[PDB]
Design a binder for this molecule. Structure first.
Ligand SMILES: Nc1ncnc2c1ncn2[C@@H]1O[C@H](COP(=O)(O)OP(=O)(O)OP(=O)(O)O)[C@@H](O)[C@H]1O
Ligand SMILES: [Mg+2]
Lengths: 152, 158, 194, 194, 197, 193
């Protein structure tokens, strides 16, 4: 759709929250957590106000196999709409630790809900490095000089 | 009917009309799926109407301030990519970032003026730049329109 | 009947009616969802409005530093306020109505000037309208009026050749009922100046 | 049926290209239209220089258009008119298919619940501009091109086929005018998205 | 039986826009999903059925278990018909789907429609079939795609799962020729499906 | 008698304090409301884990502005992910007054006490947190019948004896003599630090 994710400003609340969800589903041993990010978009700064957990069970045989409830997402969104109505789907968080290429397929699913281009916010739960524990990424489509067609 | 009658005994053979009827059984099967779908969708929809409007109905009941409207000065409506205001701001890419929709400035009888984003249910056809409005006293949003004020001695003329 | 197998086509005429009424019902319920949509959008904009809070107006009274500003709020008592990055120093200047927040007390954005609620009545009563000519035979006094008023409006450049101050200021006075008040409605109508 | 039209093409071709047509008709009877798509592809690779290709496809548009895959039909139509030495004719076919989708997706989209006809529309618009570049009305071609370019970037995720055809039109224009520089960048996108 | 939670796996191919059932095979399947759903509810209402698709090119859940048919139908509307079901990924996601429910009183049943020629390696799918018997899950394979032009690999898996169990797998063979897909699955056991205990 | 019978020291989590503040601040000047979710251990240690807000009203805080539907549903969302606990009390905002329950809230606190007797009310000032110091205080009712039975010294047994106050006259009379105060401390792990 667009690129307008030049800056991502992220509330400290969200980080705190992400660690809290991660432990209370007790995803350890290379298990992941996905939740929705709620917040503003159509701004060059993307504002991450809030997050909420989605139930997501991620497999150990493959990384290509996952369960995620689509029915759940809307219910969560409409209750939060009642609180403050400036909150809309702006992506989903991955609990890291690191980027995956099975996240690309999940990105495309969140692209339905959005009216912006999905933010994948790898919120590390490992607190690695003395700098930020967040790297941010957005799935964008390109051709490239190599002879590489339609790359995501 | 313009098919399958005594018009078509003349026009076509009646075993072709025997097989026609068993294809209208096939097409009303497809259509029957499609009607039940659209009922179900309207069952989800009516309760999303109910959800919004109950909120408005708490705000609607008593008490609420009574004020006049300074002016409607508006701001460009929300549909743009860079801002949606009439007055130029610093920086690029906005639409809800500090950008705001139409504006109504209202003057209280508590003696102040408040720049509020006007209620999207109350029109500009229901605002005149002197109109006597309700304002919700807890958080300043134009609640309703009411008719122009009259002093008690003018009520006593009638 | 023609046929005795037209007894079976009564049953097929019967389905035919059904099939064409189900076509009509699919396009009915899509026009009924289109009506429950405008009513849902009508109430959804109110939800976005109810959750918005107000703002309190000031004006820039005086630059204090770079990031601190003296505003005189329309509460009445002066405050000292902050800036978002939404505004600039050079978009703020004295006598600009600026908005404030009601709990952060920061300029978020520049607003156009305030305009009293009284004075919009004065701009929207001119009614009693008539042409150039109001009352006749006193045309000579109509033409004198536009010497002061209409003539410097169209061309200030003819009052430049003379080197006089551009004419202004009129006192109309006289016995009552004599179209002094009508003439006033006619020089607003005819010229069509503010 | 189709056998009689088909027979004429079978006579004129090589003996060793004779069996290929029989298999196309074999699938049609059985009502496997995925398998017909695959069968059709084969002829086109090694014999689109034939006028037999053209013929074949004309009969196919008439008896298949919701039967074989929609996309396969329009891709054929790009190929077909490169083989037609007639331009007037080219315009006629592009506009018949374009018109045909407009009425069709009203019925088509709701009944299946899916299958977008606007992908066909772009493939169609690309070929119209292409036709005006081969007739050498360069003002006309260019102006359809600017309009088309706005339209592509609006569509979020572009199939490689659509954007490939766009980039072909863009190449053809720029070496006719002999702007070497404009050609170079556009052909790097062409070779990529192949 | 009853007290049964069923996951429907709908195949989405281009072998399903082919003339094999009036008006098409995709349209036939729509009637079938609903016929299944009503038969389980009408017997006992503590039966819910949900729908996954093979739309995209990795299976997505349209709808979880529900008692509302209107839900299943709305989500079937939302489809991609150029997608491709992969069997091996769909059995694993369905097993997970089955482990996401509101009550675990319900028997474990998958009804997976197969409408394409299967072209997934045999050797893997032996292992996935024996994984099902140790979770107490049965799988009802409706074949009408693989008979048409392909080897009968799915038959051997069915035999593998069969052991003394509450719900035990079944092989139903549905003709591919026109004979109305919806009528034929209704007459086949779908509510009179037995264990093997 | 037979227990510690003293008001819990509310230990508010790193997540929670920020979340009540963001949720109170957006709605200033209008009064805000919501639930505190937490767990009850000891006899006098409640750790409040997380919060959720109960939607706005047009008459602001009321007992009435509790809606069972919002409360229970939102609860079933968190259940599916297993981050739900039990309602240990509630928060609400007076930004127009100091820390102390208003006449309405004491009656809301009586209903809440009834359900669970460890129910706290935490009054958040989002408008006096424009300082370097956040103004936040906790209260829990001591029953009218309770004062008569003179059970007030029972509640201040086994504590440091350090309490909080807010202004004088009216505010202070409500605080000490009708409700009971207990300090608020901040809880955190080394991961969050
Ligand atoms: N010259 C005229 N010809 C026709 N009608 C006139 C004329 N002058 C005045 N009238 C009529 O008299 C009405 C009232 O007089 P108007 O208010 O214009 O006058 P005025 O000289 O300023 O005195 P006052 O202010 O006391 O009314 C007008 O609305 C119009 O119908
Ligand atoms: Mg007068």
């Amino acid at each position: 759709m667009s690129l307008q994710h030049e800056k991502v400003t992220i509330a400290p609340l969200v980080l705190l929250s992400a660690l809290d969800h991660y432990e209370r589903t007790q995803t350890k041993e290379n298990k992941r957590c996905v939740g929705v990010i709620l917040g503003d978009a159509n701004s060059s700064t993307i504002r991450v106000t809030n997050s909420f957990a989605l139930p997501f069970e991620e497999d150990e045989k493959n990384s290509d196999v996952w369960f995620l409830d689509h029915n759940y997402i809307e219910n969560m969104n409409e209750m939060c709409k009642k609180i403050n109505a400036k909150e809309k789907l702006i992506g989903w968080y991955h609990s890291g630790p690191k980027l995956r290429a099975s996240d690309l397929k999940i990105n495309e699913l969140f692209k339905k809900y959005t009216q912006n281009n999905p933010l994948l916010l790898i919120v590390d739960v490992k607190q690695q490095g003395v700098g930020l524990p967040t790297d941010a990424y957005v799935a964008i489509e390109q051709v490239k000089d190599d002879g590489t067609s339609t790359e995501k | 009917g313009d098919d399958e009658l005594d018009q078509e005994i003349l026009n076509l053979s009646t075993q072709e009309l025997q097989t026609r009827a068993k294809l209208l059984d096939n097409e009303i099967r497809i259509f029957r799926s499609e009607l039940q779908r659209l009922s179900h969708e309207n069952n989800v929809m009516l309760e999303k109407i109910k959800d919004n409007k109950e909120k408005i109905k708490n705000n609607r009941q008593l008490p609420y301030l009574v004020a006049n409207v300074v002016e409607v000065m508006d701001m460009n409506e929300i549909e743009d990519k860079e801002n949606s205001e009439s007055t130029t701001q610093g920086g690029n890419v906005n639409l809800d970032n500090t950008a705001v929709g139409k504006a109504a400035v209202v003057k209280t009888s508590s003696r102040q003026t408040v720049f509020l984003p006007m209620v999207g249910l109350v029109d500009p056809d229901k605002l005149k730049p002197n109109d006597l409005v309700g304002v919700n006293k807890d958080s300043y949003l134009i609640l309703d329109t009411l008719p122009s004020e009259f002093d008690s001695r003018v009520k006593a003329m009638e | 009947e023609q046929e005795a197998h037209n007894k079976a086509l009564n049953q097929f005429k019967r389905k035919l009616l059904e099939h064409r009424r189900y076509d009509d019902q699919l396009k009915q319920r899509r026009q009924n969802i289109r009506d429950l949509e405008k009513l849902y959008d009508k109430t959804e904009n109110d939800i976005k409005a109810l959750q918005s809070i107000g703002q309190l107006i000031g004006e820039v009274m005086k630059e204090l530093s770079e990031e601190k500003y003296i505003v005189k709020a329309s509460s009445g008592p002066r405050y000292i306020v902050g800036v978002r990055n939404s505004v600039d120093r050079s978009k703020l200047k004295k006598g600009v109505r600026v908005t404030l927040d009601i709990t952060t007390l920061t300029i978020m954005r520049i607003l156009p000037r305030e305009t009293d609620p009284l004075v919009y009545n004065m701009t929207s009563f001119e009614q009693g309208e008539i042409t150039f000519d109001g009352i006749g035979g006193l045309t000579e006094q109509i033409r004198e009026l536009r010497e002061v008023i209409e003539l410097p409006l169209k061309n200030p450049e003819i009052f430049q050749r003379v080197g006089i101050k551009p004419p202004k200021g009129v006192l109309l006075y006289g016995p009552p009922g004599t179209g002094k008040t009508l003439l006033a409605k006619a020089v607003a109508a005819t010229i069509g100046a503010n | 049926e189709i056998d009689t039209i088909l027979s004429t093409l079978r006579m004129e071709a090589d003996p060793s290209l004779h069996p290929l047509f029989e298999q196309f008709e074999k699938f049609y009877e059985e009502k496997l239209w995925f398998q017909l798509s695959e069968s059709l592809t084969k002829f086109f690779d090694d014999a689109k220089s034939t006028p037999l290709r053209l013929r074949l496809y004309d009969n196919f548009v008439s008896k298949f258009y919701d039967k074989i895959n929609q996309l396969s039909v329009v891709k054929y139509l790009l190929a077909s008119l490169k083989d037609s030495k007639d331009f007037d004719e080219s315009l006629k076919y592009l506009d018949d298919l374009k018109a045909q989708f407009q009425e069709l997706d009203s019925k088509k989209q709701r009944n299946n619940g899916s299958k977008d006809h606007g992908d066909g529309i772009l493939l169609i618009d690309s070929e119209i501009a292409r036709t005006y570049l081969l007739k050498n009305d360069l003002v006309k071609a260019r102006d359809l091109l600017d309009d088309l370019e706005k339209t592509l970037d609006k569509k979020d995720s572009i199939p490689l086929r659509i954007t490939n055809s766009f980039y072909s039109t863009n190449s053809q224009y720029f070496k006719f005018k002999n702007d070497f520089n404009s050609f170079y960048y556009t052909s790097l996108l062409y070779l990529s998205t192949l | 039986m009853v007290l049964e939670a069923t996951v429907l796996v709908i195949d989405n191919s281009e072998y399903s826009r082919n003339g094999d059932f009036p008006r098409t095979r995709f349209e036939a399947q729509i009637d079938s999903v609903e016929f299944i759903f009503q038969a389980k509810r009408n017997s006992n209402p503590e039966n819910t059925v949900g729908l996954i698709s093979g739309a995209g090119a990795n299976p997505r859940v349209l709808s979880t278990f529900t008692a509302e048919f209107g839900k299943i139908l709305a989500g079937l509307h939302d489809t991609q018909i150029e997608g491709k079901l992969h069997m091996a990924t769909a059995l694993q996601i369905a097993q997970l789907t089955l482990k996401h429910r509101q009550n675990k009183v319900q028997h474990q049943r998958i009804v997976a429609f197969v409408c394409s020629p299967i072209s997934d390696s045999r050797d893997e799918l032996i292992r996935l079939a024996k994984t099902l018997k140790k979770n107490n899950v049965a799988v009802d394979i409706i074949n009408f795609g693989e008979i048409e032009q392909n080897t009968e690999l799915l038959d051997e898996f069915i035999a593998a799962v069969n052991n003394p169990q509450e719900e035990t797998s079944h092989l139903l063979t549905v003709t591919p020729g026109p004979r109305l897909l919806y009528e034929n699955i209704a007459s086949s056991p779908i509510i009179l499906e037995e264990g093997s205990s | 008698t037979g227990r510690d019978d003293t008001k819990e020291t509310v230990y508010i989590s790193s997540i929670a304090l920020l979340k009540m503040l963001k949720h109170g601040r957006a709605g200033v000047p209008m009064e805000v409301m919501g639930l505190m979710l937490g767990e009850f251990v000891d006899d006098y240690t409640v750790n409040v884990v997380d919060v959720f807000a109960m939607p706005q009203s047009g008459t602001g805080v009321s007992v009435e502005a509790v809606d069972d539907v919002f409360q229970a549903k939102m609860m079933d969302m968190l259940k599916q992910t297993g981050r739900d606990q039990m309602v240990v009390g509630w928060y609400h905002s007076h930004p127009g007054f100091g820390c102390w329950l208003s006449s309405v809230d004491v009656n809301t606190q009586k209903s809440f006490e009834q359900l669970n007797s460890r129910a706290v009310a935490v009054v958040v000032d989002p408008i006096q947190s424009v300082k370097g110091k956040v103004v936040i205080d906790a209260f829990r009712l001591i029953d009218t019948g309770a004062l008569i039975n003179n059970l007030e010294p029972r509640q201040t047994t086994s504590n440091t004896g350090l309490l909080n106050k807010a202004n004088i006259q009216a505010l202070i009379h409500g605080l000490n003599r009708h409700y009971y105060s207990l300090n608020i401390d901040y809880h955190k792990t080394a991961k969050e630090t």
